[PDB]
Structures are given as structure tokens and as C-alpha cells.
């Protein structure tokens with residue numbers, strides 16, 4: 361087992377840190393995070409300014425869902441429903 | 449030698465009588481000199497060292513040979529400062545000790561530096577317009593009461609050359625694809641100066657400025673706020689997701705972004721490269737409050 | 745030659761553990 | 767898998783138990799430091815015949 | 816507990832088995848040091864320069880510059896490592912090992928007081944604690960100090 365360990369370690373680090381595919385995956389996930397953040401920024405920018413009432417309600421709908429109390433209530437309801445369906 | 453003590457006492461009395469008086473002029477100096485050890489001032493030890501690219505507030509005139517100034521830094525204290533004629537005498541002494549520009553330290557600048565936002569792409573396009581609109585709304589709403597917003601339509605990049613009635617370049621000013629008849633530029637400059645004279649922090653929405661280097665030789669010397677996207681790929685995806693109309697203008701936006709990237713960091717004053725809107729907003733607000741306290 | 749391969753599969757699991765260590 | 771993942775967690779735990787004992791190098795190099803500290807203590811012998 | 820003992824033994828052997836044993840592992844250098852202790856049957860202590868060329872010509876294939884004995888880079892290995900001439904070309908085993916380290920390391924010829932002196936004086940404090948057994952500071956000055 362120790363010999364197989366050494367054989368695997370001889371390649372898990374060498375020739376792997378060179379191309380840095382782990383760094384590539386980290387860059388991909390960082391890019392996804394930055395994209396979602398900037399898209400949220402753009403949505404905020406377009407929302408900050410028939411249709412006027414709809415735009416006004418858009419701000420309140422976007423703000424309400426982000427509240428932690430709403431998230432706690434939703435997760436509690438989901439857990440209760442899952443227990444109910446698992447009450448069998 | 450009681451005359452020196454008498455004049456020192458008189459100067460100290462005048463200072464203490466006018467320590468709290470308003471500011472006469474705003475000064476932006478690009479020359480380095482140490483005045484702390486200068487005993488030539490009437491009140492020895494009360495000199496202020498003015499260095500390159502420093503901002504000062506001139507309060508009043510002691511005489512033609514000495515004036516009164518304060519530093520715009522936080523908790524600044526008013527003291528003596530060489531007068532314009534005294535600055536001329538000091539530079540004469542400096543060139544006497546050693547062996548052109550003749551730029552006075554008291555360069556005519558607004559009361560405090562205006563704030564202008566640049567990046568991450570060409571202004572007037574959808575992405576940059578929304579990104580700067582969000583920040584403008586945040587700045588207006590949070591710091592309402594002592595913050596002013598100013599919009600300028602005409603170009604402001606011409607303030608030193610082609611504005612001196614230079615025969616070579618003042619000819620091509622009407623057919624440069626811009627509303628530039630010099631007179632409106634001067635009117636807007638005077639408008640900026642008079643708005644600054646109110647001693648209320650102001651910002652400029654320069655629809656023409658898209659690069660720091662085109663607003664450097666000007667006498668405004670504004671505050672540059674840089675907001676940038678981490679990756680060009682992210683910017684491209686944002687442009688594609690924004691709509692089907694900016695596809696024709698994607699290349700110019702990318703060109704502007706990559707040109708702005710190459711700008712040295714020292715040219716910019718602050719950097720806002722935080723993905724979250726709140727983080728960048730607070731980062732800008734802290735600097736704004738620090739600057740506001742510095743002049744107050 | 746079977747079990748070693750399974751152990752190599754376990755080594756692959758170790759590689760999976762490597763995939764779980766990366 | 768998951769127990770193995772728990773074991774993988776144990777792996778990380780072992781990586782915390784023994785793999786975090788690398789401390790600070792505090793020498794000129796990382797491998798050449800080992801060579802220097804290994805080749806400076808070596809002493810010649812005689813091997814009498 | 817057997818898993819713990821396995822982890823202990825593999826960590827103990829990590830600096831032995833999972834090392835650079837591919838080509839130029841430090842344990843290969845240790846084996847060549849043992850060879851040096853064995854490859855010189857004369858064991859005269861002060862091996863002449865005309866005697867090292869006869870037998871010590873083959874120093875080390877991996878660590879050595881090449882198969883151009885006595886020195887592949889004659890200029891570098893006889894100037895940067897000064898030609899040992901303590902007694903008709905006397906060569907010290909410790910001095911030769913230090914020369915091989917210099918081949919592995921990177922310090923220039925005489926005039927390297929900065930890096931070489933830092934290495935040879937930080938011995939006392941922070942590189943290789945040798946406050947005692949100062950005999951090296953009596954055999955290196957012929958070569959390095």
C-alpha cells in the first residue's frame with residue numbers, strides 16, 4: 361500500500377501543478393461568481409429607475425426575497441412538509 | 449533686536465484674530481520646499497512645507513511678503529505661508545543658490561477636487577451607463593444634503609493646448625465632431641469653479657471623459673474613480689446578456705476596456721474592483737467621508 | 745491480477761480520494 | 767464512498783493531524799537546505815584492511 | 816488504530832519513498848557519499864591531485880557535470896572551486912562534498928563573499944548549527960572561507 365502510495369504521489373503533484381488544472385477550475389468558479397454578482401448589479405441598476413407600478417413592485421419583490429426571515433420561514437416550511445410526507 | 453520680537457507678536461496677534469476666518473483661495477502646488485525651518489517668516493516655527501502635488505487653502509494676506517495658509521489634510525491647522533511675492537523671492541533665492549516653468553504654487557484650482565467616474569467601458573453604452581447610474585443613485589441618496597451632482601455635455605479634454613488661441617490647433621475646433629466653440633468650455637469651467645466655491649462636495653458626470661490621461665494637463669485636477677471588471681470574458685458575457693442591440697458595438701467596448709486596463713495604477717486615485725455592489729459603494733463612501741472631513 | 749486491479753480501482757478510489765483531496 | 771469520504775475527511779483530519787506539521791522552512795531552500803544539512807554532517811571513515 | 820499506524824509509517828517514509836528518487840533524490844546523494852567512503856580504498860586522508868585523477872576521476876554520474884574526468888568544467892571546477900593544493904594537491908573528503916554541493920547549489924567563484932560568507936557564517940546562527948566542531952572552519956578556508 362505504501363508503494364502504491366508513492367507511485368500515485370509521483371504523478372498526483374508532478375505534472376499536475378505544472379498545468380494547474382485545479383487553478384483552472386478555481387478560475388472557472390470565480391468567473392461564475394463574478395458573473396452572477398455583476399449581473400445582480402446590472403439588475404439593480406435597471407430596477408432602480410402600466411409599467412411604473414410594475415417597476416415599483418419589482419424593487420419590493422427583489423428586496424423581500426433576500427431577507428433572512430423569509431429564508432428561515434421557507435426552510436422551516438420545507439422541513440415541516442418533508443416530515444409530513446415522511447410521516448408514513 | 450526687539451523689532452523681530454515686536455513683528456512676531458503683531459503677526460501672532462493677527463493670526464489669533466483671523467485663525468478662524470474663511471478661506472481666500474484654493475492652491476494646488478507642484479513644487480517641493482520645506483518651510484518649517486524657515487525663520488524668515490515673522491512667527492518662527494510656524495511655516496508650512498509645501499510639496500509637489502499638494503493642496504492648500506489660503507486664508508488671508510499678512511502682507512505682500514507673507515500670507516496665511518492651511519493644509520487640506522484632516523485636522524489641518526492654519527499657519528503662515530509664503531506670499532505670491534514672497535514665493536517669487538523664495539524661488540529667486542533657490543535659483544541664486546543653484547545656477548523656465550515659473551509655475552506658482554498657487555495654481556488656480558477649484559475649492560476641492562471634483563470627482564469623476566470612468567470605466568469599465570465607453571460611456572453612453574448600456575453596461576457602463578447602468579453601472580455608473582447605480583453608483584450615482586447610491587451617492588445621491590446616501591449622502592443627500594451636502595453632495596452636489598453636475599453634468600457637463602461639452603468636451604473638457606482641451607484645457608491647456610488648443611485653448612491658448614494657438615494658431616496651429618485652434619483652427620480645427622469646430623470640425624472635430626464636438627460642440628466646442630471655446631466659449632462654452634470656459635463657461636463650464638467657471639461654472640465648476642463657482643459650484644466649488646460653495647464649499648459643497650461636487651461630482652462631474654463627464655460624458656466625454658473615458659480615460660484619465662486625457663484629463664491630466666488640465667487645471668481641474670479631479671478625483672478619478674475606477675470601476676473595472678475582473679476579466680474581459682466576464683465583460684463580453686455581460687455585453688451579450690444585456691441585449692441584442694449592443695452586439696454591433698461590442699468591439700469598440702472591448703477596445704476601450706483593454707485600453708483602460710493598460711493605464712498605470714498610479715494615475716487612478718481609488719479602485720473599485722469589488723464584485724458586490726455594497727462593497728464598492730462602502731469603499732467609495734469611506735473615501736468620500738474621509739475627504740469631506742479633511743476639508744472640514 | 746483481478747484483486748490488484750480492484751485495489752488499483754481502490755487506488756482509483758484513492759485517485760477518487762485524490763479527486764476528493766483536490 | 768461516503769464513509770470513504772468520511773475517511774477522506776479523516777484523510778483531511780490526518781492532513782490536519784500530521785500533514786500540517788510542516789511548520790516554516792527557516793532556511794535557504796527547501797530541498798537544497800536538506801542537502802546542505804545532510805552533506806555538512808557527513809564525516810569520512812577509514813575502513814581498515 | 817491500524818490505519819493510524821499506517822499513516823504514521825507512511826509519514827515517516829514520505830521523506831524516503833515519495834522523494835525525488837526518480838533521478839536526483841537526496842538519498843542518491845547519500846548513497847554516493849557512502850560510495851565516496853568506499854570508492855577510495857587508499858583512505859590516506861590527504862589524496863593528491865595527481866592521485867584523485869587516477870581513481871577519484873569518476874565522481875558521480877547524476878550530480879556530476881559529465882563524463883569528462885577529472886572535471887568536465889575544468890575551468891569552473893578548478894577556479895570557482897579552487898584547485899586543492901594543500902600538500903601536493905591534497906583533497907579533503909568534506910571539502911570535495913562541499914564542492915559537489917556547490918555544483919548542486921549556486922555560488923560563484925572567489926569574490927562570492929556575499930552568498931558564500933552568508934552561508935558559511937550563518938552556520939553559527941540560522942543555517943546549520945555548528946557552534947561546536949569548528950574543524951570545518953579550518954579546512955574550508957583552504958577552499959571556501
Ligand SMILES: COCC(CCO[C@H]1CC[C@@]2(C)C(=CC[C@H]3[C@@H]4C[C@@H]5O[C@]6(CC[C@@H](C)CO6)[C@@H](C)[C@@H]5[C@@]4(C)CC[C@@H]32)C1)COC
Nearest residue numbers: 361365373758761762765777780781785818821822825829
Ligand atoms: C510531503 O508530502 C505530503 C504533502 C501534504 C499533503 O499530504 C498528503 C500525503 C498523502 C496522504 C496522507 C494524503 C491524502 C490521501 C492519503 C491516502 C488515503 C488512502 O487511505 C488508505 C487507508 C487504507 C484503506 C482503508 C484505504 O486506503 C491509504 C492506502 C491511502 C492514504 C492514507 C495514503 C496517504 C495519503 C495527504 C503533499 O502531498 C500531496
